């Protein structure tokens, strides 16, 4: 009920470190260690106290909600070569490798998509030491003549100079590389002690170089997890970004105003002009973390340098990694195109050069299956992308996709791959949906009785008579854009009062052209403003805006520009009376930048409505994308005042300036068919 | 009864466009119309199937519970000149033509004006198509040239030329009008195309001009309405406008408040300034259907206007018809007496000009037996209007109007007038009488058990130490005035609060009628009220109204005003706190609705008691008329505030102000010998 | 403010054809107006207090009309018997009005109750002060300076 929001709070009140599934391939690699005394033997025999309980009837390991033997082989032969060194509990290995003989012909049958890290590289390092004990296993195999022969055709191409002088990503999987040096390569480590944040790449060196200061990397893991080891630790800032990236896309984050910035507190201290990574103590950066942080650092309003992308592109090619090539997966280029829209005109042109890459990169790849990822599997990854390419940030309502994000999100039925596949429950649950399919569902419930209540007032106050062809389609259109922006149950008085004066100014806009302007109108028009009920805290200064609005028609008598943008000054000034909020009076730049914001908001809709008249004449395109090349810069200049804290006017009045003008950008970018779908999706058809 | 209480709901929510009987004369006019697709027989064979198989073996056609051959010859002679003409089952032609020629002698001695509309002009239209078949038709009858003389006087009462400049109501029976210009007719039809919305016009249309649009109308009401033609379709603004007039007059409408709101809006969706017809799209409109729905909509807080009644004032006259001055029935003028009872002083005086007409129109024809009802046969014409005219709206109680209403309605016991004696089955069903009279029957036990329940309270509380004149008449009349305004069973509790605390104020009146007041009585009477059924939910609430009332007995002592101007505010102050509903703080007009209301009722009953202190004193009627014309004007504004839709004050808190002065306005206009004739009816002489 | 103007304007059409004057609600136009310019909101969250603010307008409005036919007969004196009798009906309606404003066992604030006293005292004094005297009061209080 309400405690589901409490449970995520207590799952966020205690953020120490990551929630990752405990792995088994490196559990054999840590359990294969002699004691420093040597009498105790294995160092942490809790690993044996974990394996003989975490097991299924075929003796197998891992993907207990799936089936993939290509990783499961790497935990079924590793667990038995750890079971014959100390040579305890020989009861289920002889059946646990006998099942592999049943499926030693099921090896080469998985697709090109699932090729794990260390596959042709780190797996033959298991096999030649498996036969060090010479257990009953088919060594040669005609299916294995790919990982055998093209072992070298993966590794002999990289030079031994660049791996003995320069730090690159090959320090994670290092068992496949042999005859290396330890004394000259020990100054190119990670910061906490690891070799690229993987304990196997410590344990491959702890056997030759017993670095006691690196023993405390593993000893700290078996103390914190109380036995057992996962494949990657730590994941502190990988945890933080994927927490909040789900939260604002799901739409439950607005209860957590204390907590949401607290993650952003840890990022702004560790932000650098070079980049950031999965953990903080890793040198080799990438593209994902620099990009997706910037879309979340800038959004809540922290000034963040937009020049970090200059490292991660070269020669007109935006690479996924520093110093190493990539067959470009979608999971960089999705969120790289997402942060390619929050731009300011004062920024560097590298942000311009990114979106001219990804749109050329993602438009063509929609037909064939090149949009798949080699590192994930989930319910709908590409379905989000086709929405993001055609619905930009400038015209998206903040409610339409929040309904659609439910229809694309699997939850904890989605698995990440690595060396060993795993899940993340501080990140994905079946509970974030339970919070979302509770509060959004009753919001969908509690708002459709409001339009039921908003119906009859329109049909009783004598105003429905004239205007359009039918009242009902204008009634549901005017409440959609007036409630998709403000969606919480405490500001309904602003919400419904918006939608009323929305329907007031347009049926009288219809009435003036039907008589030909205000030259031959005789009925008094300042008395229609009283059909809104009298309240004391609101309706005093409300009527002052309608009076000053009336003379814009006498101003636009015999002058042939459109009259849409000045009607936005109705909405942007009436609504704040329903919030009872002045500007802060005594501060003159507060007086200034409100007026500076009022001008540009009135200036978008002159450009937009003239475009709609220019396009519906069937005129050519080389002028109507010029209007798109004219309002692309008056949209981003609107953002710099909103996002950056340009003066001390409180944020509450600043969302609404953007909340009105995005709605007018939405009407002029959706055909009259496709909004009638979105009305039918988010309002009526209930979730569960 | 849940079969019947929901049974009205399930029947009155399946409202199509009415349910009326199949005609026997218009169905004859469409049966002779053949196919047009190169066929052999009729276009509509299932209408002649309804002709063949419905018939009652007495020989005639028409209605079942009436024998007026003024209807039957239109139902026989037109019907038998069709199926013989198509030569389809002429076996039953002699079956019908046998009994006519020896029973058509009764046509000579008929009644003057129980004749069908357009009977005297459509029967000579049958003669040229009867001698087309030339059966043994005895034309020798004095009802033949005497209507020929009326026919050529109807070729002298209708004009040819000026008729095309404006439509008139004779387009419902236009078979007596032939050989005219038809492209001048084409711009004189409604959007159904059928002239005066009647199917008989289109039979003449397919002799000249094969328009598709006058065909699909007739084809849809046979092929989708399952054979046979009605007399006028549709009937949507007659079946909704009268069923709300009938069901609310029963008084059992309280269980249907979800439903009466909707059909009233379809009245308002069809609201026009030039009136409301018997159908939705008629190009001609009446006054009686106009000035009835006007009255009902004002009685439910809607926004109406009586400025639309300058369109039937015939220079100080009124008529049912728009252009002609024919002698009408009483029910146009009966309805305009109902609507001119209540008004607001911001209007035209046309309702004054009509009420001085509608009294003086009905004043003489009450005194004689001139109760001619030309368009409706019903049970009790003069006795109902004798209740309506000889009892005013200011003293019209909601229960001495429903107890009398179980006397005049029959349900199936009516028959309606059109071109065919037809019937309705929706609002002319007596199935409600198995419910509503049983609702009064369980109402009668719902008031009987508290007759004795307030007898024993008068003894056990012992108020007879200063009781007064006569208990059993005055305990009853206090409960007559308390049960004649609140009778819903969920609110049966606070009704007993009314009749109880009223007599307490009558008791201390009989204490202070002769002992002066506070200057001779040291009696406290503070906690002496608390012999009432008393809760802590009335923790102080009765005491502050009490001592303020005794302060009026203190202050107005040795004055000469009425000491019932304080009792009137006291009762509703007592009634509401028994019912337990509070006002909000709200805006300033909300108490301004309150504080202007309580001045009006404190002025009227103080004014009203002057007349009771004048009639028995026997003074001049100039003072009587100058105490009546003043007390009517205080009423005429007062009724607006209790009957608006714009009231911020709560709904049921409003009409309680109306109810208590209604009892004050009643008993000043009645005698004790007319009052027992109401007491023995609504309490003692039960139904059934 | 302007609804009380609208409530005063609709009360014109109440006595549009009647024989009364507009004085019995001109004060209600003014006793409401001091609460506006001043923001003095009433607390009707309790039932007996709203029963008193309604009752406070009961006393004033009858006085204003009983003074109205007083002064229009005062210029005439067509019934000199009732001239010394209308005002002996008036005073014992003032006698109860000046009770409830002066007393304190109510729940209304102190400063807003004498506003009821302030309107009728401005109203009653000009009914008893001749036009020869109302000017002779003004000059020697507000124009002819002290010290």
Numbering used by the authors:
A (entry chain C), B (entry chain A): 80 to 767
C (entry chain B): 621 to 767
Direct quotes from the study:
OsCyc1 catalyzes GGPP to form syn-CPP, in which new bonds form between C6 and C11, as well as between C10 and C15.
Two of these dimers assemble like two sides of an isosceles triangle (molecule A/B and molecule E/F), and the other dimer (molecule C/D) lies in the center of the isosceles triangle. Our analysis showed that the cryo-EM structure of hexamer is almost identical to the structure observed in the asymmetric unit of the X-ray crystal structure of OsCyc1. The catalytic centers are located at the outside edge of the dimer, tetramer and hexamer cryo-EM structures.
